[PDB]
Design a binder for these strands. Structure first.
Ligand SMILES: Nc1ccn([C@@H]2O[C@H](COP(=O)(O)OP(=O)(O)OP(=O)(O)O)[C@@H](O)[C@H]2O)c(=O)n1
Ligand SMILES: [Ca+2]
Ligand SMILES: [Ca+2]
Ligand SMILES: [Ca+2]
Ligand SMILES: [Ca+2]
Length: 341
DNA sequence: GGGGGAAGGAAA
DNA sequence: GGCTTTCCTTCCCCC
């Protein structure tokens, strides 16, 4: 394989500096306003002028404003970034039939029937970047390599607005020098567990006894890291069909009172069905986040499609099961639909 | 022993 | 804090 990875730059914030060009140069910060007080929520994304100062995905909208109090804070327009994204995706579908849409702003292209070497791959990349810049004035980064994992890593290294290749020789250099915590699919929890085992690089997984890896991070993530360490990782570029869709809302104030909860839940279901659009789900899950923020969720799977009426009736049953089996207060309430048809 | 599953992770 | 969507890793049902 010769994989080609695209990763739209500071995406949500770009798609904002593209419908109001006056923003370029100024720090922008797309936030998610939760709804329980002046500026409560978090930062979705922030253009690079804002990151230079500490504002990044995650930190509360309130820390953001303490750091860059005079920045352009805008609310999240997800339905809008979603379209811009698709339009771009469609642009990429021409450069190859084998495409995997990883996220709302990440796509893997398998161009192993579209080019011959990394020099051709690299040129196809630039061609792509440009096309995108031409049609939607959106810069994106490109990473090319022998599999999805190293193509992604490539882009991680080149973003923003770049292009790169980690040829067969580099891969071995990396399997040895790349901080394993920088490997796609390894976060803080698993990173720590691996640091405790002396595993700081990929190559470090071939030495540790296996079953003592399966023991600490999980059978799957273990297999994952090793195959990568053996330069034997090959996950095909497969079309991805969305598997779930949901919406959680945040209540104006905590409670365990079913009738105080009901309005928000029914409000989330509605919005949830608007999204589904033609998709019929056979499984519904009610999700609530206790005052302490842990995540409780009860579900049920049907042997047929779920009609709102059903979603309505059944979701109350579920919600109840939560209230009956958890004594904590609720602040967040929502739903989620799976097992489409 | 294991193939095929509802809930709480763990990462993006 | 912090959506939204993933895989998963357990605790089962039953071969
Ligand atoms: N905690 C996060 C991380 C990411 N995103 C969103 O996910 C998409 C891209 O992911 P990410 O790479 O994390 O954000 P970017 O702003 O695109 O940063 P960069 O260009 O450096 O990758 C963005 O459109 C945004 C989000 O809502 N919340
Ligand atoms: Ca991105
Ligand atoms: Ca991304
Ligand atoms: Ca990453
Ligand atoms: Ca990491």
């Amino acid at each position: 394989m010769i994989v080609l990875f695209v990763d739209f730059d500071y995406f949500y914030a770009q798609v904002e500096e593209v419908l109001n060009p006056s923003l370029k140069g100024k720090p922008v910060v797309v936030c998610v306003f939760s709804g329980r007080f002046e500026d409560s929520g978090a930062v979705a994304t922030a253009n690079y002028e804002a990151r230079k100062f500490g504002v990044k995905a995650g930190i509360p909208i309130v820390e953001a404003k303490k750091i860059l109090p005079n920045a352009v804070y805008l609310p999240m327009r997800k339905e809008v970034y979603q379209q811009v994204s698709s339009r771009i995706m469609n642009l990429l579908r021409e450069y190859s039939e084998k495409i995997e849409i990883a996220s709302i702003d990440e796509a893997y292209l398998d161009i192993s029937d579209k080019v011959r070497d990394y020099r051709e791959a690299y040129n196809l990349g630039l061609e792509i970047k440009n096309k995108i810049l031409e049609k939607e004035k959106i810069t994106v980064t490109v990473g090319i390599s022998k599999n999805k994992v190293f193509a992604k890593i490539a882009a991680d290294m080149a973003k923003p607005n770049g292009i790169k290749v980690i040829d067969d020789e580099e891969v071995k250099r990396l399997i040895r020098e790349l901080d394993i915590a920088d490997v796609p699919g390894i976060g803080n929890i698993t990173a720590e567990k691996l640091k405790k085992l002396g595993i700081n690089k990929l190559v470090d997984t071939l030495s540790i006894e296996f079953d003592k890896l399966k023991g600490m991070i999980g059978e799957a993530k273990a297999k994952y890291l090793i195959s990568l360490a053996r330069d034997e990782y090959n996950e095909p570029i497969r079309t991805r069909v969305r598997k779930s869709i949901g919406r959680i809302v945040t209540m104006k104030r905590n409670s365990r009172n079913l009738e105080e909860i009901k309005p928000y839940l029914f409000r989330a279901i509605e919005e949830s069905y608007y999204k589904l659009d033609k998709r019929i789900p056979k499984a519904i899950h009610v999700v609530a986040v206790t005052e302490d923020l842990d995540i409780v969720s009860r579900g049920r799977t049907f042997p047929h499609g779920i009609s709102k009426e059903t979603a309505y009736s059944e979701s109350v049953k579920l919600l109840q099961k939560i209230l009956e089996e958890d004594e904590r207060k609720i602040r967040r309430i929502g739903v989620r639909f799976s097992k489409f048809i």
